[PDB]
């Protein structure tokens, strides 16, 4: 396992995808031009995982940019790191989606999917040992969710033995009070349960609460929310990009974190929580399992952990990490399943991000994530009971039965989390 | 002289095999470039160390070893390490995509793409042997390659080398330095499919070695480096009878005769003493009776179990160094009634003793201090079933919920194999209970 | 049939077409196959001007469809703060109950329309109103972990 092909779809996917490249390029010593300016040798050991190698020691990010809105490409080009992207990887259509999952998945998006797959094969063949794909998108819109899931099913047919990893942004009325978002989100979850190997659930509801209440921001913006997203995506991919003890394998991560195929939705966490303008080991382990440090609006103390992976970063005592983690597992033993022995793995890396000296990234497969799916299901049913704006989807060639099946599939997902949450070993 | 071929599978098998062959060269006096000044017979010979080392026309001594792993990361260090000039380049076999800690990926899918190439390279080494007696297989229980590919390899070697013996050095999983959560699965799956094809297996409990490095060596956070150096010290004491002159366990067939009373119970327990830290270079040299007393202490064992809870069926003592035979006879005489050592009624209550009058060799950079005498006890006790019980319990916890099973079913393996492998482990625990534990 | 043309005119938001049709005797209280009046569709699609014009021409502000949905139910669900105040201004029942047991307060709480929740409470929204599952508006806030909504319901 080696190279990873990055894909960003929609306005949110390209926005959170652009911030992902601006952060790791700073950690690897890469300037917007591409010339390596790092001051340590470890910044180039596993650099080939996310970057190509152009002539002249130039590093080209293995990223594909797609959106039905033609104005998003200028939003990315005008960015700071918007010049390093390969001009051949800009696939933008003419007609947008208008927050319609149907236009992205059946009409407007079905015309643009073949143009993207041509550049996916172009990138997948320039890899020495391709391991999987990485996608950033929101589930509330129409492009990143309707065409994003369609792009996944297309890649799943031609690359079935490769790992599909997504960073899906969940909608929230506290950030976007668009009443058709529970539709597109529910229809996307119906596809993500079947065609993804591991999905990071980034909830705008939790992102808003962290900025508004934890960071004391009366009016959080998309820049403030994405600051928590960029720091999260950097931590969950620290082992994939830097030398350490973990094998940096997408499949090894999926085998050790997915006990049941449908339960592959992770609850990311990060500590410490800081803002854009501005701790010990026992404090990082404490804040890590705190509900205030979760990127999903779910209380982990309301459910039971199935599998947990904690990545520590910075210069810290290797022995103390094994002490505080083992101690936290005892004080919260009622929140770990007893039929999965040794279900908490600990990783530690020596290169922390900039601005901090220590950090901790939490990746938990918890049954408490059902509270997220219950929130979207309750809003979906409320709108679907009255059939509000249902003609916006049937007019694009969608069947009404696809809503009840998505509602039924998502309710079955919730019952599955509750099933293993009440199970015992004896 | 009968040649022995060593096989190293997976990261654990390769890294431990690297430390063992380093120690073999230091004990035999072989330079890292394969030269041996004290080998007056150039181009060949009939010496005892030729069981593990072949000789070329230029006087180079090459190990009879094969390194195989489904990914090249671990073996590439052996290709650029200190002994990069020692091994045949065509005996370092590497794939591209590993088994991802999946027994099914190593046995049914990924392992099939390189199994025929590995056997052809083993065939080349077998043709150079005049009287090949068997193989030594190094692998882990928890890894996808160490469990899946090794089982596929052992099944093939039985068809191509039916009369030859096969011995294992297996790595028992430990939560302190484990890699995967499904390691209880892989360990049970590989034990069931390899039980028929293995004549004798020495299990190394990573937790037992981990505690020894903490207590005896004062190492707070032991790494794989500290574990493998101590493991190689014990592997050398076990294979010393095959590589030097002696009258105990002189060939692989005698290993089964002295340690294995019945085919299925071929898991002897190994104990080593003394283990002294290198920070104590001016330590007191323990007597023969003191190091022999330390063989029946559970804290010095390579597998976490209490031999007082079980009965012995065999017991061999391999001494190394300044050891007078009358001191061993006096020691065993006292350590016969002064302790609660129980032998089964159908076994001759005795102790086989072999003495090598050369003290153990320490490696530069190791954690162990030079000792003038040491002992390695190999005993087949029913108390080692305690380790199978710990492994079978963690297996039942996850399989009762069918957790992580879809990863195995999706790789060409049927779910029914999980049950018959667990039933085989149940029949193995009964084998020890029918003897007494 | 001018009633069916008035339904689509209120849905599409054609203000000029609504006036001309009502001048020719169009049934302002006409219904579709599901019982939706022109006031239902106008409050659903955010056509505030058509809402006020219909209310001045004999539109039933408390009309229900086959599922018991009043214009206040749909306006609170979609989140039209301006239309909700106009409906409440013309005597809309703030505590009307649909077939699912929901009130306008329930739908605004579920969809996160905090401003609408604040307006309904000031107009006499029953905080003790239960749905067919026994949940009230405050039960939705606690079950969903919405502390912002919980503070509004604790005035
Ligand atoms: N004592 C010791 N144990 C090791 C060493 N390396 C790995 N292990 C153990 O082996 C187990 C995992 O098996 P590995 O050998 O690393 O995996 P593999 O054989 O390469 O198979 P893959 O899953 O495909 O990578 C872990 O539980 C480790 O504790 C080592 O160098 N020394
Ligand atoms: N965290 C975050 N969320 C975003 C951002 N941009 C859009 N979103 C969310 O995405 C949803 C809208 O989907 P969008 O991606 O804009 O539509 P699309 O063009 O069809 O993919 C809204 O609910 C927003 O909350 C962003 O920059 N950061
Ligand atoms: C519950 O048991 C376990 C949980 C997690 C384990 N490993 N976790 C990872 C996580 C990674 O990135 C976040 C890796 O980088 C992609 C990664 O590469 C190997 C492993 C291992 C476990 O035995
Ligand atoms: Ca010779
Ligand atoms: Mg490996």
Author numbering:
A (entry chain B): 1 to 278, 284 to 431
B (entry chain A): 1 to 437
C (entry chain F): 13 to 167
Question: What text comes from the article?
Answer:
Tubulin is the key building block of the microtubule cytoskeleton in all eukaryotic cells and among others essential for cell division. Nine structural snapshots from 1 ns to 100 ms complemented by simulations show how cis-to-trans isomerization of the azobenzene bond leads to a switch in ligand affinity, opening of an exit channel, and collapse of the binding pocket upon ligand release.
Correlations between maps in the microseconds (2) are less homogeneous and stretch from 1 μs to the opening of the exit pathway at 1 ms. Initial conformational changes of the βT7 loop follow on the microsecond scale with further rearrangements of the loop, including a displacement of βAsn247 and βLeu246 occurring in the millisecond time range. Interestingly, some of these movements are reverted in the microsecond time range, where the βT7 loop starts moving. At this stage of the reaction, global movements in the α and β subunits are directed predominately away from the colchicine site and may cause opening of a ligand release pathway at 1 ms.
